[PDB]
Amino acid sequence: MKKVEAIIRPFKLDEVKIALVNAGIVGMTVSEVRGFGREFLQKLKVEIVVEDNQVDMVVDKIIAAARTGEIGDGKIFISPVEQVIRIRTGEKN
Amino acid sequence: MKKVEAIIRPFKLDEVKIALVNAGIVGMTVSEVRGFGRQKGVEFLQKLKVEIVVEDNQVDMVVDKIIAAARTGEIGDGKIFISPVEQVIRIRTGEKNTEAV
Amino acid sequence: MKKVEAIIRPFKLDEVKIALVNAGIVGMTVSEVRGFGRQEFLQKLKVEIVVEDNQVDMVVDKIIAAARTGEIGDGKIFISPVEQVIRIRTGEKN
Amino acid sequence: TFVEIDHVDRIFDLPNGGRYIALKNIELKIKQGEFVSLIGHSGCGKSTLLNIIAGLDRASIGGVTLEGREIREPSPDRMVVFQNYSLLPWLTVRENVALAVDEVYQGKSKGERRAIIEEHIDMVGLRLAANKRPSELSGGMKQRVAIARALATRPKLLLLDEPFGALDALTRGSLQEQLMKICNEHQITCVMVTHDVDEALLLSDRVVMLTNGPEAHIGQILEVPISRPRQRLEVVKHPSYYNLRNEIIYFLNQQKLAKKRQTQQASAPLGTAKAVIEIGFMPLTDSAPLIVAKEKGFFAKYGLDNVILNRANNWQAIATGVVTGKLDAAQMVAGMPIALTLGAGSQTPTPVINALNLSRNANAITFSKRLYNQGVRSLADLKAVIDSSPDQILTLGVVHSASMQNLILRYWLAAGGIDPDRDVSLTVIPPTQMVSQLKAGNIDGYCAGEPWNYQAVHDDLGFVAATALEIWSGQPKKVLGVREDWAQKYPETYLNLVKALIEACKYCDDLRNREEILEILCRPEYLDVNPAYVRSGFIDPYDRGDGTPPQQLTAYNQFYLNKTNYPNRTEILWMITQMARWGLTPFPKNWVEITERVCRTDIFGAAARDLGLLDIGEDDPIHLFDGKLFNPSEPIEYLKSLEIRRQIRIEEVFISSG
Amino acid sequence: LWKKVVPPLVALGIFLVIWQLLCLNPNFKLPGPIETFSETWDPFIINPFFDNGESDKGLGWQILSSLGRVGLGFSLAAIAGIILGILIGVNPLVYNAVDPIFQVLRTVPPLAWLPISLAAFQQANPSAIFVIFITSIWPILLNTTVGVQQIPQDYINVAKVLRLKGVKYFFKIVFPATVPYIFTGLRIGIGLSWLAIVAAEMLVGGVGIGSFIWDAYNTTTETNLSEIILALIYVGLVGLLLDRLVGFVASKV
Amino acid sequence: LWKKVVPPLVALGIFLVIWQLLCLNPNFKLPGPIETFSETWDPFIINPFFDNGESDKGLGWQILSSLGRVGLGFSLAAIAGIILGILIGVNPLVYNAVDPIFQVLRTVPPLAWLPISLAAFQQANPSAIFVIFITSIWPILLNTTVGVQQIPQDYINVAKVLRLKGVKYFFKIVFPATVPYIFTGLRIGIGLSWLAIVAAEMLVGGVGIGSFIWDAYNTTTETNLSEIILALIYVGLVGLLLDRLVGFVASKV
Amino acid sequence: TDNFLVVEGVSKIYPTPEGPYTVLDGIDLKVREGEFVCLIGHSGCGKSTLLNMISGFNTPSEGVVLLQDKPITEPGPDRMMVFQNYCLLPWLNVFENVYLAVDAVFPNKPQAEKRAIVREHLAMVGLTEAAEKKPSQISGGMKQRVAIARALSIRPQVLILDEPFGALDAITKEELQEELLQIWSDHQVTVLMITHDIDEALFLADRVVMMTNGPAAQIGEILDIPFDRPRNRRRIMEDPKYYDLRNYALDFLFNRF
């Protein structure tokens, strides 16, 4: 399991979810942020975790979702994840 | 040296810290996020992104405490992503990797 | 390459601006967190800075210097790893 | 994935809080273009399961999910075909079909919807009778309209709630044949619910046979390997179609047979008022939950009053005591309860149920220093060494003949290309004095518990070599076994006994309280050793004793963490396919019934929800170092795919009720 | 024809024949069939609409005047029976909260409302309608409300998997299902309405079938009894056709 | 219990308040709940069996006066379809030869017989009993004569396979197969019988319910309407008892 | 036994104002005493009419049916029948139901002796425990139980069995078939069951006859069941000869017709 984390403009939410819902990736946490760049913007923080193979597929969709050339559109942070434990079931990995 | 991040139900708080505090973990960084998954409504839901850093010894025990407390039975109860941390620094003293808390 | 994710008091946000920009890396991400350590819940803010690995020391010291308060609720600094980040505007492996 | 029935645990509410549990932990994933058929003896939840899928009912826990998005209300995407005819009598068949299309396809006007009705009424074959009324139509094709209507809206999960069961057998046929052409001609998935075996197994793709009685759950997902293009009179002549039909018929018979027994068991004389309950155990730090349950008064907290812990000396004493009635509820090794219920050794099968598996991952296969200096440092090294020459063929050791010490050890040896009973020798030896056994030289290896294995490391008489974690990190080692006779009697004093140990496990699992337990396990009446012998692996980093730095084993004495406390069937059944692999017992032909008889999860479920605990045990694929993907629905195939084994012999094992 | 139409015609002759010979017997001093149509053939049988003034019109007018009241009446009840009948039954709570009251109110016979109906409405004409309206909704309302809750569970579920909830539900599942029950309610409502109109006039008088039969009894003449029997048979026929009229529309739907 | 008794009592409270507040309107000249029960409490509730001597006793005697008439009467009609009903039906030739006549006679409104009933019988007491007998007879035998024509074909076959014929066939196959339908006729008949008695006394006078309402209504007084509405409650309530007790008998068999 | 119930070319022609229908045509059946003939066939093939004809409820209109050389023309207690709807009177309790059959066939028998006959013909079917419950208050499976018990209260020669197991669940049939089979080898009464489920007939039969469907139905391909008389349900299905028969019957009902 690997983590994929991206920052996108607030009004672009219904461009990655739409690009991801039909991509077979259901699940994502979106939280507000206040970036600086270059007073503070009101960007959005989309956060997903997927297997290693799906990173290339999902990452391409995210960049292709909010793709408008204007400085200050965010990046795609990705981090490792040792375990992903559900709550309803309690399974592992 | 591991970092728990347990997305839980919006109201299940006050049942996590009451039980989790008994496990020797005192520091927590609860937050608020909007979630979207297999639950039905109307499109984006509200969840708390409980965020804890724990020692490797009790990582498997802290996660168990949250699961029992935050469980509901119906889907949409969240997950627990455990990620590593290398150089946790406490600005009280700037100590080594040890939490000292 | 290290996702510095320090937690600081709300009042110590504008001070780090001079230190943050002076460090050479100014861009970052900010948010609000209902922190809970010793001190019920009290509002704090969480700052995420993906600083280059070779300059992690040069940034951590500045934050503590500008975030030094002494009283309870001082804050903590985390250092999480990253393997490669990309720019959504361009999309170049880093 | 497509429709997947997540863990669904529909509870039915009854007067006086009956809480009659209909289904529990029904996990089942359906792919696209699938025709899963939910065969099952009447009494279990079949319509209840289908109603949940149809959405007409709300699942108490969990819930079905379609295309990765839960369904909470009925919708025209998962149609149904009710057992009752359910046709609007005041509408012609064309208008009956027009009811669904006129409502769903609201974006299409007249003309482009007339074709939909006309063609759908034609594929099902209900062509000539297109203007009649449901009263006029006979019962035969009165159920074709319901199928035609359901297919008219082009649904995604067309369900079939036993649509044609009232019809006679001849009309039961010649209607499946019509329903076969639709499946072959079109691409439609379904979830059929049928009572007749021939109904399923004939137009289905994967039969999901449910268990019986309260707390139902899928027992065996039978698979039907027939080429999908099917003809009712050509599949019948398939070489291996009647073989499958005898598997379903045999299974359904067992539920019929082993349901009157359940009724008989309930209606039996109750037990007396026991003054003292004698519990047997063996000296091992892994037995901490039983000991701490007494010294800390956990038994008293639940009003169990006096309990006597009759410490044993050899593992055979526990087996003899419980079966003979001398003791009762003796903590015993994981694999022997399923060994006594099958009589591993031609002995009389005496039922011994398992409900509170209470430890895991506490075995270490240590070897003597002779192999260490020889060059043995892993499985591969040993294999070459033995191949050199017999040279006093190595004789290993095991605590008990039939348990998860003589099975996993054999599996580890077998996977290395070594025959346990030919290339080496396994001799049962009590752990108490096995420490002196190695010094004598009779054997060279161990499969004992924690405290005794470390003796060789501290005395420099051997090295740990292998470990439970690096062989299988779910390895059961202890389980609470009570004679099935002493379960209908004394319905209480068992749940209170089950509850007491669960709390004892929880108390002794926290790293903070483990230090206190160290002293309690160093008394003459309990495991008697110098306190600085059990520290390793419990509250100290494990010392492998093979010229390597100690490594802190985080989970090497699991008691509560990672969901240990659950008698999951999937891994007890893996023992049957290993006792049979070595010829210790014929592989039972009715494992689907013995397995749900030894693992009494009904007791645990009532002792977990009341106490507060994750009652839903994990689906446990038996993952060893070399995961072979054990499939807990076709053990015979798995048992036939192992390179080293003994002649497989399948027969029905019969056990007297008592 | 010869097996179902011819026989009853024979029944008339035998019934009439036995009815004869009772004139000679002093008991049952009723007009004889031979002379029942003797003094009534000319003035009444031949002329239905024998208008001559006020409260003296021929039998034709009386039937229309009485039948007209059951026309204007029983329609303010049918409209108020179907409507307000579905509203009860869909909600089990309200049904059980008023069901016992209708049961008691459904049993009070006609001509028990009339004494109080006249009090509220001084005029005589708008009192026969009220008694008919209030004595005819009960049979309709009880038959309509029961039909709503006797809808088979089969039709509800097939109306649920299809998202038919809304107004379309009540015009494709509920209403067409209770139509058979309504006509069962109208079967006895129409007859019960006729049961009161004929008896709702001989107390208050006025033009109509009632007060023609009743007034004849009060005034003894040479033709009083003959006209009562002649009127007594028309009430039977009109009742049959009026009730059988609802028996024909029922077949169509 | 609390879910089926509380609801209906709520309706009365709503009915009472709705019934109340209509007195404030002078045009709506009807008694209100506050006083319709107040003055009537002493002379007609606390002492139901108050006897004065001349057609002016208490309500209890008035109710039992008419209840006796429908009891002594309607027992001749009670065994009408029990005897005459079974004789028809078992004879298909005559069943079709009497159906049209009884259908017309059945629908003739009750109390339309009274004008000729008083003509046949000079007296009045054996005239308000005949009206009940001739009006309640039809629903009993018609609903009994339908059973003999609708005994299930299943019970005929089980009797043909055995050599069951003659008297033994009647008392074990046919007659028990109409009892479930006879009690449908009695339920309709008894309710329809209650209608005739209440209205019949309103035109012949004398002691008995019904005449009480007309007697009070005609004799306008200070509070005549006060007891008429109460009399409405009794006649409505009493009929419920008669209708429901007959159903209880049908419950046993 | 040589010449028990025989059917000699019976053929019934219904009115059918549109013309002829000839539901039956050229039927030739020879039932031997103590057999278990079965008439498995499609719905609407005239199979019910055929037994409904020998039972005496119809007239062949083309031939005769001879029972010991005595033509059958009227219903009687000898050809005791069992209907599909259980033909049970809801008034009389289960006990009084059986007593009705015995009384109608043994009128002069002493009273309190018939009470024994009905009582002793209620334990072979396992129904003496419930001898007072009314049919409306008894299980559907047990309801069918007192229709052969009543039919066995008499001493019949031919016990015509219309499809009795048309509503019983798949579990009650297994118990009921054995009970019916068990009592068959107690009296040795010829029985002519009508059964749709093919697998039932092979387990429970001696000579099953399949009649071609359509307007002109004819008896064809009279099978023979050679399994041992003390039938074991689970010992024949796995036998490698019940396969060659069942799949052959399916080839004469679905493939051909």
Ligand SMILES: Nc1ncnc2c1ncn2[C@@H]1O[C@H](COP(=O)(O)OP(=O)(O)O)[C@@H](O)[C@H]1O
């Ligand atoms: N060190 C950092 N860590 C995390 N996020 C950052 C950092 N620096 C900048 N960002 C985010 O990236 C965004 C800037 O995107 P972009 O304009 O493409 O790059 P730049 O601003 O460097 O030209 C800002 O809105 C800010 O939120």
Ligand SMILES: Nc1ncnc2c1ncn2[C@@H]1O[C@H](COP(=O)(O)OP(=O)(O)O)[C@@H](O)[C@H]1O
């Ligand atoms: N891939 C993912 N990454 C991050 N969060 C997720 C992911 N999948 C689900 N979640 C979180 O889990 C919550 C519930 O989602 P889901 O998994 O559909 O239900 P459940 O956890 O009961 O299975 C959501 O609110 C969502 O925020």
Ligand SMILES: Nc1ncnc2c1ncn2[C@@H]1O[C@H](COP(=O)(O)OP(=O)(O)O)[C@@H](O)[C@H]1O
């Ligand atoms: N282990 C931890 N997990 C999560 N958050 C922590 C942890 N330790 C410290 N924190 C954060 O830092 C703060 C610690 O406050 P406190 O315990 O009073 O010590 P300090 O005075 O150093 O801040 C909290 O607001 C909390 O959000």
Ligand SMILES: Nc1ncnc2c1ncn2[C@@H]1O[C@H](COP(=O)(O)OP(=O)(O)O)[C@@H](O)[C@H]1O
């Ligand atoms: N209203 C109810 N109250 C309590 N239990 C019920 C109710 N409805 C169904 N059940 C339970 O659900 C189970 C399954 O019922 P049903 O669907 O009728 O049979 P099956 O599931 O075998 O088709 C039964 O064992 C029954 O006890």
Ligand SMILES: Nc1ncnc2c1ncn2[C@@H]1O[C@H](COP(=O)(O)OP(=O)(O)O)[C@@H](O)[C@H]1O
């Ligand atoms: N009154 C009738 N007029 C004409 N044909 C009839 C009549 N009754 C029955 N039939 C015909 O007799 C045929 C034989 O029916 P049968 O097969 O005995 O019924 P089952 O399928 O129940 O055994 C039917 O196909 C039917 O068309």
